[PDB]
From Swiss-Prot, chain A:
Function field: Transcription regulator of hematopoietic cell differentiation. Binds gamma-satellite DNA. Plays a role in the development of lymphocytes, B- and T-cells. Binds and activates the enhancer (delta-A element) of the CD3-delta gene. Repressor of the TDT (fikzfterminal deoxynucleotidyltransferase) gene during thymocyte differentiation. Regulates transcription through association with both HDAC-dependent and HDAC-independent complexes. Targets the 2 chromatin-remodeling complexes, NuRD and BAF (SWI/SNF), in a single complex (PYR complex), to the beta-globin locus in adult erythrocytes.
UniProt modified residues of type Phosphoserine: 31
Zinc finger (C2H2-type): 8-30
Annotated site location: Required for both pericentromeric heterochromatin localization and complete DNA binding: 22, 25
Full protein stretch here: 141 to 169 of 519
Post-translational modification: Phosphorylation controls cell-cycle progression from late G(1) stage to S stage. Hyperphosphorylated during G2/M phase. Dephosphorylated state during late G(1) phase. CK2 is the main kinase, in vitro. GSK3 and CDK may also contribute to phosphorylation of the C-terminal serine and threonine residues. Phosphorylation on these C-terminal residues reduces the DNA-binding ability.
Domain statement: The N-terminal zinc-fingers 2 and 3 are required for DNA binding as well as for targeting IKFZ1 to pericentromeric heterochromatin. The C-terminal zinc-finger domain is required for dimerization.
UniProt-recorded name of the protein: DNA-binding protein Ikaros
Subunit structure: Heterodimer formed by the various isoforms; this modulates transcription regulator activity. Heterodimer with other IKAROS family members. Interacts with IKZF4 AND IKZF5. Component of the chromatin-remodeling NuRD repressor complex which includes at least HDAC1, HDAC2, RBBP4, RBBP7, IKZF1, MTA2, MBD2, MBD3, MTA1L1, CHD3 and CHD4. Interacts directly with the CHD4 component of the NuRD complex. Interacts directly with SMARCA4; the interaction associates IKFZ1 with the BAF complex. Interacts with SUMO1; the interaction sumoylates IKAROS, promoted by PIAS2 and PIAS3.
Cell location: Nucleus
Disorder this protein is connected to according to its UniProt record: Defects in IKZF1 are frequent occurrences (28.6%) in acute lymphoblasic leukemia (ALL). Such alterations or deletions lead to poor prognosis for ALL. Chromosomal aberrations involving IKZF1 are a cause of B-cell non-Hodgkin lymphomas (B-cell NHL). Translocation t(3;7)(q27;p12), with BCL6.
Similarity annotation: Belongs to the Ikaros C2H2-type zinc-finger protein family.
Reported tissue expression: Abundantly expressed in thymus, spleen and peripheral blood Leukocytes and lymph nodes. Lower expression in bone marrow and small intestine.
Swiss-Prot record, chain C:
Entry comment, domain topic: The CULT domain binds thalidomide and related drugs, such as pomalidomide and lenalidomide. Drug binding leads to a change in substrate specificity of the human DCX (DDB1-CUL4-X-box) E3 protein ligase complex, while no such change is observed in rodents.
Organism for this UniProt entry: Homo sapiens
Protein name: Protein cereblon
Subunit relationships: Interacts with KCNT1. Component of a DCX (DDB1-CUL4-X-box) protein ligase complex, at least composed of CRBN, CUL4A, DDB1 and RBX1. Interacts directly with DDB1. Interacts (in pomalidomide-bound form) with IKZF1 and IKZF3. Interacts with ILF2. Interacts with TRAF6 and ECSIT.
Span of domain CULT: 250-358
Range of the intact protein held here: 69 to 442 of 442
Residues involved in Zn(2+) binding: 255, 258, 323, 326
PTM remark: Ubiquitinated, ubiquitination is mediated by its own DCX protein ligase complex.
Lineage: Eukaryota, Metazoa, Chordata, Craniata, Vertebrata
Tissues and organs where the protein is expressed, per its UniProt entry: Widely expressed. Highly expressed in brain.
Keyword DNA damage attributed: no
Disease tied to this protein: Intellectual developmental disorder, autosomal recessive 2: A disorder characterized by significantly below average general intellectual functioning associated with impairments in adaptive behavior and manifested during the developmental period. MRT2 patients display mild intellectual disability with a standard IQ ranged from 50 to 70. IQ scores are lower in males than females. Developmental milestones are mildly delayed. There are no dysmorphic or autistic features.
Misc note: Thalidomide was widely prescribed to pregnant women in the late 1950s as a sedative and as treatment against morning sickness. Thalidomide was found to be teratogenic, causing multiple birth defects. More recently, thalidomide use has increased for the treatment of multiple myeloma and erythema nodosum leprosum, a painful complication of leprosy.
Function summary: Substrate recognition component of a DCX (DDB1-CUL4-X-box) E3 protein ligase complex that mediates the ubiquitination and subsequent proteasomal degradation of target proteins, such as MEIS2, ILF2 or GLUL. Normal degradation of key regulatory proteins is required for normal limb outgrowth and expression of the fibroblast growth factor FGF8. Maintains presynaptic glutamate release and consequently cognitive functions, such as memory and learning, by negatively regulating large-conductance calcium-activated potassium (BK) channels in excitatory neurons.
Length: 32, 826, 374
């Protein structure tokens, strides 16, 4: 894992992530 | 593969045109009437009208105008048919033999050309220099009037104004000048052009483009003293002439549109104008000599004379008598008195010529003979709406029942010795909130009366409001006595409820006979109906009571009695209801189709379904399975007006451009693919618009079975009041009669020299194929009216077979016996 | 210019093997060709009629096709992309056809014997029955072309009353004839397309019903197998009526991105507050979401744990929901915090992520086929 509390959050939908990389990937999906 | 015979039982009664002049002889005055394919010629007497000659044409009469060229004794008649057959006819009488000889003829159709929005417009120059025809948008065809032009060779002239509304030839012009109203993105305008036969082109008109009213719909050329033209619109009437342009907006013409006119005085001082609602006005043109003798228009005036039938055309005969040519009602002869009567009208009816009018629905009933059938039709529209009971003499005898409102559907109930009729009356939105009737009609003057109890849609209603003055039609189920034809009861339907279908039958174990009605809730904001009902009524003790009520998700377009069950059609679904012991409808089957189930007809367990675009579909109720199954279909896009099941394998229909067609269940079919397709096995250009097909016959049914040559009998009602009959034949009888038609055509004289083959050929604006699987009964029956040598020529070198053996040389006396047997089917 | 064959005529034209998607008359087909047989074949067509066949496959795996569309090439250019020399060509759909024979040549390219299906054009339904006296009243005095005035049904009421006045001579009412009217049917589509998504109507859709019907048949959110039904239809009237049926049958919503996942149905829509089922809500960072509330939704994965932080529906905790297939954000799952809450569990879907679609029946227990109406 990374950080159990999920401190990395998405400003567009509030999706929290354990690692920054996963959040970066998530925010790239909003662009489409 | 299909062998059918079609014959006219009643000729078209609706008048689509009328003109006066001196056609027979230069001395006496004539009135020519056009009743679709028929042309009636009368002589105007001081008493009334004297019938002189009646002829039939092989074409629907589109244009009909009289004209006297330079160096001619009497007037000639120019006629143009719907299939573009142009002709100049002359009246020729020798002792006691009358004949309408064809002076000149020819087809004026143009391969390629978009037909105009305002239809065919045919006009003649006042000096008879040419005939101007407007058939297609962007082109003006010209037939020059020269003694050499016998084939009617004509040339088109390029017209920059595509959307021409009305056009006329002006009077008192040096060169032939056309005046017309047309539309462009800046509105409507009136423009003129000079037509040059030498250059074969248009030239600058005497007075270029002038702006007219938004709804300018009529153009009237005014004779030599005045000159110029009158343009009529919705709110105004304007006169234009060179520099002067006088316009009046009389309030008396605002309530309805002026749709027909006629010149009273030959100088143009008076004109008759007729609106859509039957009113008759007098347009007067005041004169002014102006010293030098130029004479100018001082003023325009409109006076309301009175009410007539809804006039299609008008024609002033003489001494105050006007002939009112009607399509929606009876045509008339009316007197125009100088002084009014106590009510205020200046019009007084003289004669009333019967018009079966738009036959929208009909039925066959025995009534009193208990053997010989009689035909009851839903005729006319609005105040002209009525019922007509047609029966044979034992010539056709007609009894009229005026309703003063539009009748729509009709069915008979023997158990209660009466008829059920769906009908609608127009009411106007009142200041108070409710609606007010226009006149007292059949639904308002009923002995017993009732209103539908709002339960289903009183709670389930959309929010909206109707503004003052708006018209709204009120639907009613009328119970009419079979003997007296008095309105025994009138049941009004819900607000916004449109009654579509009506049947009278016994359902399930129930011994009572009910009047079932199918409806649809029509709101203006709602495009396709999403609400409707099936109301089961029982008429007893002089009152109509609601037995049951079943809500549905759509419009109940059609319903039929199906083996003790009710087969209804809700939009795309074909539903089967069962009548439960609790006296309620219960759904047993549903069949979701690829078309709108408008046309619903049935034979035993077979169901014929059809939509407005000639999509034909054959379903079948599987009793052991308890559901519907599609057997076959034939979807060719074209407008379809009516449908019927001839026999277990053949299906008759009425498709676009007044054609009849027969579809058949494919025999000798190995593959499922071919079994599932209905083959087109018959096509025939009837020349009438069929609204209703009805199984039955207007002749004695014949108790003892004596080898009938024709099998089956399907009557039909049309828009022009024509009633026809269709029947099936054997291959032998068909091939004989077909060979007979082609022999008959060589000896028979066609008015305007139009070919029978061309006339009956199946026609639409896109496709035009020859007629098949149909014998023209009117042509076959005309054999008995011809002369013995022409019969000898027709039967010359022809082999006739009487059955089994003896295939001998045919004689006119053998054939007379055969055609005489055919005349007995109607 | 323009090369066009005769109606119902028999023609033999080539089929590009790389192509598969249905081509509707009027819409453009861009192509990228690499193989010399494809390039050389197209170069020959430029010298000849410039036309080739585009088959409407029922099954692209087995290459099964009964109908198709002739594609006229209107642009050719030899480009270079990613270090690859490729020719780029643009063709436009022209005539529709029925497939008679599919003979395959020595190459991968195949010829196709085809019968040209004509464009059925009918006159006005009233043209036959119109009264000669009323012919001059058939023409209208221009269009109101004010979005508000023509959206207002009072004008269409006047149109119906005037155009179909002679319905009184027939056995049917005016309103029935409007159901088979080109202008009314186009307007109904335009209004429902605007209802689906806000857009400029005057520019985007053509005024001609033949062109309009094809433009819509190409853009509808449907399966290409269903689209074949629109290609088979020859009358623009029937084509428009079929398109409105298809539109009315789009009672479900799917992932706009992948369009392979049915999220929810219109039946599941519900109003939690008096504002309405759909309403715009802003998040704590300024992102505005037009959110639709539905009782149930599926084919979604939840991301993270639920949270009440800045919840748009007090008393509920949001959990981020994304597409099972493409992982695109679809919205949130709202779960109640207390036991006395009314719906208890619901979903807030973002409108922009959804797209209308016909409910699919992937289950083989009761696969009742979609029966479109003309
Ligand atoms: N706390 C954060 C932080 C970042 C992004 C969001 C939120 C948040 O609460 N919402 C939505 C989620 C859905 C909801 O109910 N309300 C919101 O404001 C976000 O997009
Ligand atoms: Zn996000
Ligand atoms: Zn997805």
């Amino acid at each position: 894992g990374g950080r159990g509390e999920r401190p990395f959050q998405c400003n567009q939908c509030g999706a929290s992530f354990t690692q920054k990389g996963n959040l970066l990937r998530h925010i790239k999906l909003h662009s489409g | 593969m299909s062998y059918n015979y079609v014959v006219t039982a009643q000729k078209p009664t609706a008048v689509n045109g009328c003109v006066t002049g001196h056609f027979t002889s230069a001395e006496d005055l004539n009135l020519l009437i056009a009743k679709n394919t028929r042309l009636e010629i009368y002589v105007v007497t001081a008493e009334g009208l004297r019938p002189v000659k009646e002829v039939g044409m092989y074409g629907k009469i589109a244009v009909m105008e009289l004209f006297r060229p330079k160096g001619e004794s009497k007037d000639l008649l120019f006629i143009l048919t719907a299939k573009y057959n142009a002709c100049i006819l002359e009246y020729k009488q020798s002792g006691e033999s009358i004949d309408i000889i064809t002076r000149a003829h020819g087809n004026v159709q143009d391969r390629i050309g978009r037909p105009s929005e305002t239809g065919i417009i045919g006009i003649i120059d006042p000096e008879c220099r040419m005939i101007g025809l407007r058939l297609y948008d962007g082109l003006f065809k010209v037939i020059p009037l020269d003694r050499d032009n016998k084939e009617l060779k004509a040339f088109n002239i390029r017209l920059e104004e595509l959307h021409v509304i009305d056009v006329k030839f002006l009077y008192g012009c040096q060169a032939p000048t056309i005046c017309f109203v047309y539309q462009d993105p800046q509105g409507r305008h009136v423009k003129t052009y000079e037509v040059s036969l030498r250059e074969k082109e248009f030239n600058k008109g005497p007075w270029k483009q002038e702006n007219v009213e938004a709804e300018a719909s009529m153009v009237i050329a005014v004779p030599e003293p005045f000159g110029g033209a009158i343009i009529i619109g919705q709110e105004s009437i304007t006169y234009h002439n060179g520099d002067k342009y006088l316009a009046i907006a009389p309030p008396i013409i605002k309530q309805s549109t002026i749709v027909c006119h006629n010149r009273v005085d030959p100088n143009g001082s008076r004109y008759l104008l007729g609106d859509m609602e039957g009113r008759l006005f007098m347009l007067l043109l005041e004169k002014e000599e102006q010293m030098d003798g130029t004479v100018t228009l001082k003023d325009l005036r409109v006076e309301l004379l009175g009410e007539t039938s809804i006039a299609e055309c008008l024609t002033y005969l003489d001494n105050g008598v006007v002939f009112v040519g009607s399509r929606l009602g009876d045509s008339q002869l009316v007197k125009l008195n100088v002084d009014s009567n106590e009510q205020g009208s200046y019009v007084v009816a003289m004669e009333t010529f019967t018009n079966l009018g738009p036959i929208v629905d009909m039925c066959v009933v025995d009534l009193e003979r208990q053997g010989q059938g009689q035909l009851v039709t839903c005729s006319g529209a609005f105040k002209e709406g009525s019922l007509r009971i047609i029966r044979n003499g034992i010539k056709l005898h007609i009894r009229t029942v005026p309703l003063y409102e539009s009748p729509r559907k009709i069915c008979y109930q023997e158990v209660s010795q009466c008829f059920g009729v769906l009908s609608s009356r127009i009411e106007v939105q009142d200041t108070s909130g409710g609606t007010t009737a226009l006149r007292p009609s059949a639904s308002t003057q009923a002995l017993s009366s009732s209103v539908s109890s709002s339960k289903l849609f009183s709670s389930s209603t959309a929010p909206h409001e109707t503004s003052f003055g708006e018209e709204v039609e009120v639907h009613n189920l009328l119970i009419i006595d079979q003997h007296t034809f008095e309105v025994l009861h009138a049941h009004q339907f819900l607000q916004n409820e449109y009654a579509l279908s009506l049947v009278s039958c016994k359902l399930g174990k129930d011994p009572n006979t009910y009047f079932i009605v199918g409806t649809a809730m029509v709101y203006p904001e709602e495009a396709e109906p999403k609400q409707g009902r099936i109301v089961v009524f029982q008429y007893s003790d002089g009152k109509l009571q609601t037995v049951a009520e079943k809500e549905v998700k759509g419009a109940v377009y059609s319903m039929v009695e199906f083996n003790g069950k009710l087969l209804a059609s809700i939009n795309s679904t074909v539903r089967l209801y069962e009548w439960t012991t609790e006296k309620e409808l219960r759904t047993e089957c549903n069949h979701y189709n690829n078309i709108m189930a408008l046309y619903l007809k049935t034979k035993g367990d077979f169901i014929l379904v059809g939509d407005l675009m000639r999509s034909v579909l054959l379903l079948a109720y599987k009793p052991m399975e308890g559901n519907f199954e599609e057997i076959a279909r034939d979807f060719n896009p074209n407008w379809m007006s009516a449908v019927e099941i001839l026999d277990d394998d053949n299906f008759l229909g009425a498709e676009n451009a007044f054609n009849l067609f027969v579809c058949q269940k494919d025999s000798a079919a190995t593959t499922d693919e071919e079994r599932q397709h209905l083959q087109e096995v018959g096509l025939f250009h009837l020349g009438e618009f069929v609204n209703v097909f009805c199984h039955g016959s207007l002749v004695m049914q014949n108790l003892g079975e004596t080898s009938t040559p024709t099998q089956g009998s399907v009557l039909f009602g049309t828009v022009n009041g024509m009633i026809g009959l269709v029947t099936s034949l054997s291959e032998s009888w068909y091939n004989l009669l077909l060979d007979m038609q082609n022999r008959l055509n060589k000896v028979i004289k066609s008015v305007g020299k139009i070919e029978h083959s061309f006339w009956r050929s199946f026609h639409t604006e896109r496709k035009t194929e020859p007629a098949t699987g149909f014998i023209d009964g009117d042509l076959i029956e005309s054999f008995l009216d011809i002369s013995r040598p022409k019969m000898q020529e027709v039967v010359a070198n022809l082999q006739y077979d009487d059955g089994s053996g003896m295939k001998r040389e045919a004689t006119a006396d053998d054939l007379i016996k055969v055609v005489e047997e055919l005349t007995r089917i109607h | 210019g323009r090369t066009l064959h005769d109606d119902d005529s028999c023609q033999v034209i080539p089929v590009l093997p790389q192509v598969m998607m249905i081509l509707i008359p009027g819409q453009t087909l861009p192509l990228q060709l690499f193989h010399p047989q494809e390039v050389s074949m197209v170069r020959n067509l430029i010298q000849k009629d410039r036309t080739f066949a585009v088959l409407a496959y029922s099954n692209v795996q087995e290459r099964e096709a009964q109908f198709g569309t002739t594609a006229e090439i209107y642009a050719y250019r030899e480009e270079q992309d990613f270090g690859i020399e490729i020719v780029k060509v643009k063709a436009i759909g022209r005539q529709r056809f029925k497939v008679l024979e599919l003979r395959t040549q020595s190459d991968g390219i195949q010829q196709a014997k085809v019968q040209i299906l004509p464009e059925c054009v009918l006159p006005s339904t009233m043209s036959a029955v119109q009264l000669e006296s009323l012919n001059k009243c058939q023409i209208f005095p221009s269009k109101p072309v004010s979005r508000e005035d023509q959206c207002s049904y009072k004008w269409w009421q006047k149109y119906q009353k005037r155009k179909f006045h002679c319905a009184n001579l027939t056995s049917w009412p005016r309103w029935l004839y409007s159901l088979y009217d080109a202008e009314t049917l186009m307007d109904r589509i335009k209004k429902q397309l605007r209802e689906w998504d806000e857009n400029l109507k005057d520019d985007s859709l053509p005024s001609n019903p033949i062109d309009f019907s094809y433009r819509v048949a190409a853009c509808l959110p449907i399966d290409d197998v269903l689209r074949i039904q629109l290609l088979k239809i020859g009358s623009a009237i029937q084509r428009l009526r079929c398109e409105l049926d298809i539109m009315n049958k789009c009672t479900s919503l799917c992932c706009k991105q992948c369009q392979e996942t049915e999220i929810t149905t219109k039946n599941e829509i519900f109003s939690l507050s008096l504002c309405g089922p759909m309403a715009a809500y802003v998040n704590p960072h300024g992102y505005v979401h037009e959110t639709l509330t539905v009782y149930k939704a599926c084919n979604l994965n939840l991301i993270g744990r639920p949270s009440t932080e800045h919840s748009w529906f007090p008393g509920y905790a949001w959990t981020v929901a994304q597409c099972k297939i493409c992982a695109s954000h679809i919205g949130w799952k709202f779960t109640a915090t207390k036991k006395d809450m009314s719906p208890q569990k619901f979903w807030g879907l973002t409108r922009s992520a959804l797209l209308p679609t016909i409910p699919d029946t992937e289950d083989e227990i009761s696969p009742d086929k979609v029966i479109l109406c003309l």
